[model samples]
Target: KTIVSMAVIRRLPRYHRYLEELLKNDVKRISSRELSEKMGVTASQIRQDLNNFGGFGQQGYGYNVEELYNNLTKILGLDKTYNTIIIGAGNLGQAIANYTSFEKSGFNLKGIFDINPRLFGLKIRDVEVMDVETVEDFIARNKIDIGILCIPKDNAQYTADRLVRAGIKAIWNFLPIDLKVPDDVILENVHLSDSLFTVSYRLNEEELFKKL
Candidate 1:
């Protein structure tokens, strides 16, 4: 259909959140200028971003908050539920499993798998930790939409291979290592260290600028 820019796509979640808040505050309609003030973006920018998705605003009435929120939800694919599984029941994996908001947002945790026998049979938010050996079988049986990889760098690719072979199409990798997947498979990585180092760089920017 319409070819939207990655920049525009990235701003969509912000729009969704702002619109949701407006609806919660009983705001029936809002103008671009008003939205821009709340969202810290230029009015023209907001108008342009929304226009890429067929401009949901009326000529005089601006936009209906509820309608825009619903549209944004659909656009972001938050309308559908996805069955997700976590590989590695270590610190990161368990932390992710404990985050109840993911379930509220339609990503249902189907299972958690780890190589450690000590972790196996332990429950994280009602889902029992399973053996790594059973991961492929579990994936094959369940219609898992997303595979979350929270394992270490060394084991990341191997676990990804199993997920791919078991027909998992989407992977949310938290490991630092890059994974090779088939062209059709979608892989998204969340490198915690990279984020931390980025903050460190920003924090040291003044010193670096002085040295330069």
Candidate 2:
């Protein structure tokens, strides 16, 4: 396995998306110069970025579209399947459950759980809702690899503790709080409000750029 740099890690997704768009548009091969133009980076920069990952390129032929795209898909963890469960049945949890792209990209949705009795036994996007109390037992049997937290801030840490105790090694948290977890657990925070604020700031920047 290559030791990919953080800078390369962040940019890999951009390249992946660009490659996807090219594949979608029936484009066959692309030169570094052409890709650099589309990605708003230097050709050397693109080459250097890919080089960090045992990069692939040809002297005269450039890069093969399908090959590069496939490599990126696999590199981005789309080739491996993961068992996942949503811990809340609110709007956010429901939305995540309804999202089909997760499984399409190799995340297998196994269950949706809520503390409310009303939500239990109900189906949200085909995965039957279960009692939150059943999480530990369910995880023991099903071996869930990822837990998504859509609960309120007050319950976020408690829910995370339960998941961690159940041996869930990864978490996708939506709340604003910074969750405490074991050193081995992987936590990815999805702060909706923070993200929206960043977008708003970028929009303001665009206005300032136009005015200047």
Candidate 3:
């Protein structure tokens, strides 16, 4: 395994996507300048990013398309399957659970849950909704690798606490509030509404720029 900083790790998906496109077009090799121009990054920056892993390519020969693609794909760890479960069973959770693309990317969604009894036994994405009260036992018994929390802000912390206490490995939280998880547990907070607000601010700033 390579020691990769988050700054470089975040760009791995973008590189992989662009490489996939190049493969489709039958592009055999790419120079740093060419790839940088296509990706809006500096040629030197692109080389440095790739160098974080190891010796990548020669100066004149460039990189072999398929070889680099395969290496990067493996580095991103997209080949292994993660057994995942969704909590809340609300619209957001159900929608995420229905996304088949996650399965293609090695995230196998296994089940859905909610505290509401009415939701229990209901089918969503071919996985029967189970009671959220059983979340602890369920995770332990099923060997769940990921816990997706699509609940409200008020419930996010308590739910996370329960999940962590139940020995969950990771959490994908969607609530507005920041959750306090254990050091061993991984947490990814997806604050969608915050992103929308940021875009709104940028638009306002651009409108002022147009007045000049």
Candidate 4:
């Protein structure tokens, strides 16, 4: 396994996005210094980040934008498609279902599940909502790579457990609470409150810095 630090792993997407933007502008090649300035990261940091995978930049000529973008795409696992299912049919679940961008990035929303009887037959983004009871059976029938959990915090773990038992290898959790899973399963949590709290902290950061 690659021993890259978590810090480096997190920045790979940012690097990919920035590289994509460069390509969009018809930019051919870019030096680390220029990319660092645009990205608000140090040139050395950019170089070291890319160096983890393999140094793809030239000594004085810098990196080819298209090539780097392609490399990052593969590194981030966006080169292939993944079958995904959402476990909740609430507002957050529907919002995620409506987001078509993920489809373009290879995450295909195959199914949606909810406990509510009223929503059982409702369709969102052409994927009809099904009873949560059918989740395990559906997973057994289809190859679901990622399970998106947008359910209430109380049921998050229970649903996650079912998903894991049903053979899902990756989870995209939107609930606030952490759900335990096997070592082989990958769990990615998206706590909206944590992100919002960071914004609140930044709004008061200048004053906090003054106190320090």
Candidate 5:
């Protein structure tokens, strides 16, 4: 099977949730035009995306909700669960471990870690916190595939280095600093204040006509 385009791949989850809602309401079928109107995407674009797989929609009757849901789930790789680990057992890290959303998204929080001995053995959302020293052993033992970095900005790089050494293939960085990792490794940075400050600057700017 052709691995779907990454751009289209991201949109599949949103579509899946909408389809699930329709299925719950006992809606049997939907046309590309109606789906596009609800989703704010062009009908032709939706047809092109679904066409990547075999045609599931009828010419006039539209698509079968149940079949669409199953097909999209398989295409988006949500048919299975993925185990993940989080570094830094502070408030940010603990919050992530406690997040209920991941359960629905098919991610399992394997463990959390910090360098502080006092925090070690503490439980966050029932997941025991450990030290960074045990990360390698933890990954090897549990076979974690995803890592989340919530350490301080200064220590972000160091923590990431250790995580990479421990064979983490992907990292979700919550620090404000930019990180450099190997090309093959996936790094997703979640800059909290940057977007807020950017919008604030634009709102307060005196030169409305001048382009930056």
Candidate 6:
């Protein structure tokens, strides 16, 4: 396993999408200069990063659009299908289970788990919501590697702890709480209200600027 900086790895997907768009538009080639201009980065930096992985672009003709797209997809770990389980069958969890974006991103929504019996076995957008009692068994049997947490803030840490114990290596936490996990495990927190508050604060500040 190659240890790449998260910043570089995250940018790979963005580069992949841009390259895919270029390929779709019948753009045959792109120089590091062109890519840097389009992506708002320095050409030297782009060349250095891409060369570190492999020779992404030729010295003169630059990168073949299709080849670069495929290369970045592999580099970003998008080539392999990711099996994801959602913990919590609440509205947020149900929405995630029904979201088609995960499928578009090559993620398989294997199953959803919740402690509520009423939601257990209920179908949400053709996906069956299962009780949490079978989470460990299901994860073990299916070899699930990622989890999405939509449980409450108070229960987020506890549920995340359980998920870690159940062999989940990555977690996409939607709750507002800060979740502590093992150093090896990946935890991504999506605090929706915090973003809203930030935007609102900026808007209010902009109003003050207008008054000035």
Best by lDDT: 4
lDDT (Cα atoms) of all candidates against the true structure:
0.86, 0.84, 0.82, 0.87, 0.81, 0.81
lDDT of 1 by residue, 5-89 (tens): 7778878999998898889999998887788888888888877887766755456646888998998998888999889999988
Candidate 2 per-residue C-alpha lDDT over 1-212 given as tens digits, one digit per residue, 9 for 90 to 100: 23676667778889889999989998999988788888898888877877666755555746888888988887788888888999989998888877744553677888989999998899877789999999999987898999999889877798899999999989998887889998789888876787689888987997888889
Clashing pairs in 6: none
Supply the global lDDT for candidate 2: 0.84
By TM-score, who's the top model here?
Answer: 4
- Which structure is stronger by lDDT: 2 or 4? 4
Error of 6 at 98 (Å): 3.2
* Candidate 5 to truth, TM: 0.80
Task: Tell me the tens digit of each residue's lDDT in model 5 across 99-163.
Answer: 73456368888888888999989987778888889998898789887888888886778878877
Give all TM-scores, in the order shown. 0.83, 0.86, 0.85, 0.90, 0.80, 0.84
**Clash counts for the predictions, in order:** 0, 0, 0, 0, 0, 0
39-117: candidate 3 lDDT, tens digit per residue: 8888877778877778755547467777778778877777678888999788888888877445537888778888898
- Superposed by TM-score, candidate 3 places the C-alpha of residue 114 at a distance from the truth, in angstroms, of 0.9
Total backbone clashes of model 1?
A: 0
User: CA lDDT of 91 in candidate 5?
Assistant: 84
Instruction: Estimate the Cα RMSD of every predicted model relative to the unseen true structure.
Output: 3.0, 2.8, 2.8, 2.0, 3.8, 3.0
**Residue 91: error of model 2 in Å?**
1.0
Query: For candidate 3, what is the lDDT?
Result: 0.82
Worst 10 residues of 3 by lDDT: 55-64
Ranking by TM-score: 4, 2, 3, 6, 1, 5
Which is the winner by TM-score between candidate 3 and candidate 6? 3
Q: List the candidate 3 regions with Cα displacement exceeding 4 Å.
A: 1-3, 56-61, 100-102, 193-198, 201-206, 210-212
TM-score of 2: 0.86
Error of 5 at 125 (Å): 2.4
